[PDB]
């Protein structure tokens, strides 16, 4: 009943576990709140300005490796930034459908432009630090949103691996391989790789 | 009027593309048609069975690299792939969400085993083989719903650069950076790499 910023999200937050993205109206959550819709518009306008809300929270709550710890070579920044946004996406249902579905925020410019000031210094052209913080990204949001949705011969002790674990072993190889590409990149430089 | 299965799906995918996945709702199908709701349901019995023809026929008219041409290298055929799959992905709106929230076909569980056949004569273990194979899906689903959905002082250098393109460059430079880092643990073997 408590009508705050922090509140208003707390419940949405809790609501899109039990719905979903697509189960998540403004109507639903009001009831969940214990108020008018009337009174939830004062404060939330359309679902649109709530899911920017909570894409933006919920990166700020838990994607704890946003940057650099200081005097770490770009590889491991790539690896730890990686890591700690799947489990971010991954800590609500549908995590990763919210994060896609929003622009960016001007907190977000900053670490981005942190980040790109981070990759140059360790020797990236701005075209290719940028294309290496965004295949990290891409990467790690097409794998976690195929975890998050869901017999040939070889096939069946393939989908076993798959099903061992939760997804994590496939993200985990395909990163060190997507980080190794870059290194073969950079230290080129003007020769013929 | 005609309405067999390819008239069905015609119609389908002409309306994906004026109102998207959200949009497409059955009651909307019928009306294009020109037909009743009931007359519909004989044919397409849901939401859910008419996103699953979809997504397996935008595959079949439009994935038309899914399998290797003789004597092509592996790393070629992971390229060609990876560049078909994003053209059939992108041919459609939401495409790549009508992608996502389907299972695979047996079609496909066909072609991921002649495909992870190939991997394996080529000197990938079973698990690295499909740990390729995946990433690159990934990476590529990824990179194509950012496409799809959509001022610090780097950042407007690189910005310039994303907006200069489609999205390709960044896609075909991640991409290549993927399967080099392949390469690197395919040669390997069982040293320290």
């Given at each position: 009943?408590?009508?705050?910023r922090e509140?208003?999200?707390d419940?949405?937050?809790?609501?899109?576990?039990?719905?979903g993205?697509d189960?998540?109206?403004?109507r639903?959550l009001?009831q969940?709140?214990?108020?008018?819709?009337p009174?939830?518009?004062w404060?939330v306008?359309?679902?649109?300005?709530?899911?920017?809300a909570?894409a933006?929270?919920?990166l700020?709550?838990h994607?704890?490796?946003?940057?650099?710890?200081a005097?770490?070579?770009?590889?491991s920044?790539?690896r730890?930034?990686?890591?700690?946004?799947?489990r971010?996406?991954?800590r609500?249902?549908?995590?990763?459908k919210?994060?896609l579905?929003?622009?960016?925020d001007?907190?977000?410019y900053?670490?981005?432009?942190?980040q790109?000031r981070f990759?140059t210094?360790?020797g990236?052209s701005l075209?290719?630090?940028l294309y290496?913080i965004?295949?990290?990204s891409?990467?790690?949001?097409?794998?976690v949103?195929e975890?998050?949705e869901h017999?040939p011969?070889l096939?069946?002790?393939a989908?076993?691996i798959?099903?061992?674990?939760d997804?994590e072993?496939?993200?985990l190889?395909?990163?060190?391989?997507?980080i190794r590409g870059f290194?073969?990149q950079l230290?080129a430089l003007?020769?013929?790789?």
């Amino acid at each position: 009943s408590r009508l705050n910023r922090e509140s208003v999200i707390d419940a949405a937050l809790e609501l899109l576990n039990e719905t979903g993205i697509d189960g998540l109206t403004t109507r639903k959550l009001a009831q969940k709140l214990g108020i008018e819709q009337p009174t939830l518009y004062w404060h939330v306008k359309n679902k649109r300005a709530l899911l920017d809300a909570l894409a933006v929270e919920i990166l700020a709550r838990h994607h704890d490796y946003s940057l650099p710890a200081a005097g770490e070579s770009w590889q491991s920044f790539l690896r730890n930034n990686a890591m700690s946004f799947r489990r971010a996406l991954l800590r609500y249902r549908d995590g990763a459908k919210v994060h896609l579905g929003t622009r960016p925020d001007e907190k977000q410019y900053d670490t981005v432009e942190t980040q790109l000031r981070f990759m140059t210094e360790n020797g990236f052209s701005l075209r290719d630090g940028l294309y290496a913080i965004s295949a990290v990204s891409h990467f790690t949001l097409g794998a976690v949103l195929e975890q998050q949705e869901h017999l040939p011969p070889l096939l069946r002790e393939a989908l076993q691996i798959m099903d061992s674990d939760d997804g994590e072993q496939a993200f985990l190889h395909g990163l060190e391989s997507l980080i190794r590409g870059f290194e073969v990149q950079l230290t080129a430089l003007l020769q013929i790789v």
